[PDB]
């Protein structure tokens, strides 16, 4: 349980990691010289938190050289690379040393909610919830740590040509405007996989369940829904379209509408999917066991949440077509448009630098190195490199209003930025109720979208309406609309 | 409604507008009462099923009637982000509109009599000014006087007090914007603004239209002007960077001198404070002065086209501190109101020597967010951020319990028909509400 | 209580107005007789509202006092502010 980390040992004033080691480590696949041989050479040492108190570290070998004023002059260890202090969801952030810390925390919490390809063998796994992105892309502005996180192989986003500008005001207060034409070409399009499982229990001769296409003349608990999609075995076939309130598994239980009741499994409301595959097998008890994975294509629409790698979260305010979106001197319309008001308060300069390095990487034909602590890459070098491709050194660009063609007085900032789509869609959150089911103990509405429950008119709401002096509304909500 | 329902405006009456997509679309000015942002927030909607309740909400809880709050006798909803930055850049003295653009803007006015005003410039080319259109936006014949965020204090005393060079000193007369640049001080949620005066002089319906007009017209003009933010607004000339680096180099040298004094016992404690407390106060003073000096230098280096300045002047979002942190220097990171503590044995991190009370060792982030933070400065900044997250995650329970206690103790207290304030027990708490029998909505600040 | 000396305010409160419009709208919705003209008014709310502006609503507001007494103020005797 003693948490520790490796560090480079340091002699009087020099490191022990000589060039002969890096040479052997380069040919690691040939001479089988790995990290173990490096540790055994006495070059690296595992130091724990309790030993760090007695250790004097050096952030980089530059600190070991002779300076005009000696700070320590008696170093004993050195850090391999300062970026290693970051975790997994924080290592994916480009230029995290250029953003407010809370933002990096909020991104570390959003990176886990971003869609992509969670695993390569997703067609075989029948998981209860899985979101797969149609066209994942590796980030143009990446950190040298992603090569180890395998983010290059299983990315979770798309590089979007984002423009930081106020266009019609539909992107205000942490919102974004998307390009409908891009969405039509599969921009951020994804699929939602949901797996439904069921089994027939033979607990006793008194009552036994069985999968079979139910029948009105013999079944008792049959809903108003049609069971024609169900096969004779009661299970449904792949490739069939299923909507909410439909049946996918026809199960019946023998009684003590005679001698048997319907115990079928219906789909969740507001799903409207297609059956991807159906599997049948035997559980531990040797009873028949079925799993049905429904597939539903989720097209990005108004209300879907998007987020970059810097805490810049927001919902799609509106979707404008390519004719209505702004454009540069050349036919480059922004895939996404964000409100500049989200930058000053949050101070996410990394978003701007990423948007710059992405434009340079795309025009140069490389992948931007956004390692956090790298003195070899700053905003001036990126600006100079961008001026060589015929673009403004600060990333700005003249845009033309898509509705009237007139130039925009303020040269807008535009460039490629890696955005991510979050599992928090609006179709999974939209809820309504009007004289639905109620609980048993108290004849009040249910709880949850899954049960067609009602919203909670809590105490805080009662207090608010008391302040308004609205006695009739407060009465209708607590008595006539809840449990008369 | 939106949860947590803090104040009475967190549940307002709205008129339905049916549209295709599956989201609750709100006006942007009505997002401030609910404290709602569009980063995935969810808000409930209750539909009354009776004409009594429908009329009750239509006369007691509608949005127009809830603009001004008795909590602080000032409007709670005001102009917002884009409409406030653009209205700032629209009412300037150098904003001229052609006949085509004006006709495009006037088309978005509901309270327009259909008569185009004589332009402020008839030759050599007919040109209208932003204030000339805003005068049509302002309803009735209200009168107001405010001051822009950049209004200097040595102007109302000397000459040009009534003819401002910087176009400050907002003056509305007979419903016409005679002069001045509008911002949060004139259109925001402050007391005595053009909105508050519109709700007092004019009715609530007129103020409703005033809100809609500002949003529509200003957004349609911003569609022409445009607003953005980028690296060009966060960069400063080499002179400014040299002045900043010199200022910080001097601050670090002064702190080194303070450390040498205390180490040689050449520093005496102040009355009522310990030697350590005196040393830390002096160091904190030196660093705070350096942060303020560098911040002022960055603010002086910003051009009139800079978008950061355009955000802070109108007050739409941000402050001068944010600019100072993005351009010049982030500053000292504080944990529990004090510098970074010695988590290790007499050290903040194993990279520093023992007993190093210097600025870089105790958490002075001498770099800006644009130049990039060093590893240590990044870790310390993470500490400074984490304390904010912890407070934001802990205060919710204590404050919510306080809100509940306060309501349950005063939920039945009401103004009876004899103008006195009584509780459920019929006992008397105040012979007249607020000792004067007046409601907190119509009152406002004045001068004796 | 002596109707010759009513101490309550002569103006109609926002709550009294709300309940008056609500109850009168309900009455109109139940096909009750209308007092004023209905040139283009059908929605019971708009009808009750025009009736208030016209001051032709046949309702009496019984303002209860803390002591237990009450004062019956008719909709025509109260001064409408909004």
């Amino acid at each position: 349980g003693r948490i520790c980390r490796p560090l480079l040992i340091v002699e009087k004033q020099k490191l022990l990691l000589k060039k002969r080691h890096i040479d052997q480590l380069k040919e690691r696949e040939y001479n089988n010289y790995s990290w173990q041989d490096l540790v055994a050479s006495g070059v690296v040492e595992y130091i724990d938190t309790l030993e760090e108190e007695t250790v004097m570290l050096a952030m980089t070998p530059d600190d070991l050289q002779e300076k005009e004023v000696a700070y320590c002059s008696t170093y004993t260890h050195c850090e391999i690379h300062p970026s290693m202090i970051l975790g997994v969801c924080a290592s994916i952030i480009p230029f995290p040393d250029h953003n407010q810390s809370p933002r990096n925390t909020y991104q570390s919490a959003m990176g886990k909610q971003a869609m992509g390809v969670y695993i390569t063998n997703f067609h075989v796994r029948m998981d209860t919830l899985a979101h797969v992105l149609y066209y994942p892309q590796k980030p143009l502005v990446t950190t040298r740590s992603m090569e180890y996180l395998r983010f290059r192989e299983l990315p979770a986003g798309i590089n979007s040509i984002v423009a930081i500008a106020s266009y019609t005001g539909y992107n205000q207060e942490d919102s974004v405007i998307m390009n409908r034409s891009a969405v039509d070409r599969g921009f951020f399009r994804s699929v939602f996989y949901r797996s439904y499982k069921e089994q027939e229990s033979k607990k006793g001769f008194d009552q036994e369940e069985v999968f079979e296409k139910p029948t009105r003349e013999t079944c008792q608990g049959m809903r108003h829904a049609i069971y024609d999609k169900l096969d004779d075995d009661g299970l449904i076939a792949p490739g069939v379209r299923v909507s909410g309130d439909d049946v996918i598994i026809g199960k019946t239980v023998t009684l003590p509408r005679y001698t048997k009741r319907d115990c079928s499994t219906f789909l969740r409301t507001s799903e409207t999917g297609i059956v991807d595959q159906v599997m049948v097998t035997l559980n531990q008890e040797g009873y028949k066991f079925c799993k049905i994975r429904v597939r539903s294509v989720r097209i990005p629409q108004i209300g879907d949440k998007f987020a970059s790698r810097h805490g810049q979260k927001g919902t799609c305010g509106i979707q404008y077509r390519q004719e209505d979106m702004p454009f540069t001197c050349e036919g480059i319309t922004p895939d996404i448009i964000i409100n500049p008001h989200a930058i000053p308060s949050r101070m996410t300069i990394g978003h701007l630098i990423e948007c710059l390095q992405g434009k340079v990487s795309a025009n140069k034909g490389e992948i931007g190195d956004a390692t956090p602590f790298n003195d070899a890459v700053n905003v001036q070098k990126i600006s100079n490199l961008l001026s060589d491709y015929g673009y403004h050194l600060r990333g700005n660009e003249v845009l033309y209003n898509g509705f009237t063609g007139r130039k925009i007085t303020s040269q807008i900032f535009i460039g490629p930025t890696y955005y991510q789509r979050l599992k928090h869609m609006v179709d999974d959150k939209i809820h309504s109720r009007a004289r639905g089911p109620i609980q048993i103990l108290n004849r009040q509405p249910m709880e949850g979208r899954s049960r067609d429950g009602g919203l909670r008119f809590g105490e805080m709401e009662r207090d608010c309406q008391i302040a308004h002096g609205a006695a009739q509304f407060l009465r209708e909500r607590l008595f006539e609309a809840s449990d008369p | 409604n939106r949860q947590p329902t803090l104040h009475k405006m967190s549940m307002m009456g709205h008129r339905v507008r049916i549209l295709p997509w599956s989201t609750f679309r709100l006006n942007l000015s009505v997002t401030t009462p609910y404290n709602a942002d569009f980063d995935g927030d969810e808000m409930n909607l209750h539909l009354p099923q009776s004409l009594e309740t429908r009329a009750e909400i239509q006369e007691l809880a509608m949005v127009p009637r809830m603009i001004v709050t008795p909590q602080s006798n000032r409007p709670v909803m005001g102009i917002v982000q884009d409409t406030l930055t653009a209205v700032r850049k629209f009412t300037k003295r150098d904003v001229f509109l052609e006949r085509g653009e004006v006709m495009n803007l006037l088309m978005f006015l509901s309270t327009w009599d259909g008569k185009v005003p004589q332009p402020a410039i008839l030759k050599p080319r007919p040109l209208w000014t932003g204030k000339q259109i805003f005068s049509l936006i302002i309803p009735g014949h209200i009168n107001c006087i405010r001051t822009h965020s950049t209004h200097p204090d040595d102007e109302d005393s000397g000459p040009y007090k009534h003819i401002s060079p910087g176009d400050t000193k907002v003056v509305v007369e007979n419903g016409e914007l005679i002069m001045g640049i509008l911002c949060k001080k004139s259109l925001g949620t402050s007391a005595g603004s053009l909105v508050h005066i519109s709700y007092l002089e004019m009715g609530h319906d007129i103020t409703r239209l005033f809100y809609s007009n500002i949003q529509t017209v200003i957004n349609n003009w911003l569609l022409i002007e445009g607003h953005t933010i980028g690296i060009g607004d966060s960069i400063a000339d080499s002179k400014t960077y040299q002045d900043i680096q010199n200022t910080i180099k001097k601050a670090k040298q002064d702190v080194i001198e303070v450390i040498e004094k205390a180490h040689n016992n050449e520093l005496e404690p102040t009355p009522g404070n310990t030697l350590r407390q005196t040393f830390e106060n002096q160091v904190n003073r030196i660093l705070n002065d350096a942060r303020d000096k560098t911040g002022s230098s960055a603010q002086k280096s910003l051009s009139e086209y800079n978008n950061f300045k355009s955000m802070v002047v109108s007050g739409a979002k941000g402050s001068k501190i944010n600019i100072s942190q993005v351009i010049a220097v982030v500053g000292q990171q504080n944990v529990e109101g004090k510098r970074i503590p010695f988590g290790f044995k007499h050290r903040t991190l194993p990279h520093f020597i023992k007993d190093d009370y210097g600025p870089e060792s105790r958490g002075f982030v001498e770099n800006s967010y644009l130049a990039g933070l060093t590893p240590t400065e990044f870790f310390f900044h993470a500490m400074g951020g984490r304390e904010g997250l912890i407070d934001t995650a802990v205060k919710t329970a204590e404050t919510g319990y306080i809100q509940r206690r306060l309501i349950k103790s005063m939920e039945s207290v009401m103004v009876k028909y004899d103008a006195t304030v009584r509780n459920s027990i019929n006992q008397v708490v105040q012979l007249r509400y607020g000792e004067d029998g007046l409601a907190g909505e119509s009152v406002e600040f004045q001068n004796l | 209580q002596a109707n010759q000396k009513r101490i309550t305010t002569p103006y109609m409160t926002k709550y009294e107005r709300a309940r008056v419009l609500g109850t009168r709208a309900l009455q109109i919705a139940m096909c009750a007789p209308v007092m004023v003209e209905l040139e283009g008014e059908t929605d019971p709310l708009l009808i009750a509202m025009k009736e208030l502006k016209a001051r032709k609503i046949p309702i009496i507001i019984r303002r209860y006092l803390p002591d237990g007494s009450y004062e019956d103020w008719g909709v025509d005797e109260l001064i409408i502010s909004d």
Binding site: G469, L474, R475, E480 | - | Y15, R19, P33, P58, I61, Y64
Partner: peptide
């Protein structure tokens, strides 16, 4: 108000602090 709310009655608050009576002297359509 908490008591009348628990009983689902018109709480003596705002619109509940008074009662409305019909005026037969004015009901003259």
């Amino acid at each position: 108000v908490s008591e009348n709310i628990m009983l689902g009655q018109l709480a003596p608050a705002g619109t509940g602090c008074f009662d409305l009576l019909l005026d037969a002297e004015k009901c003259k359509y």
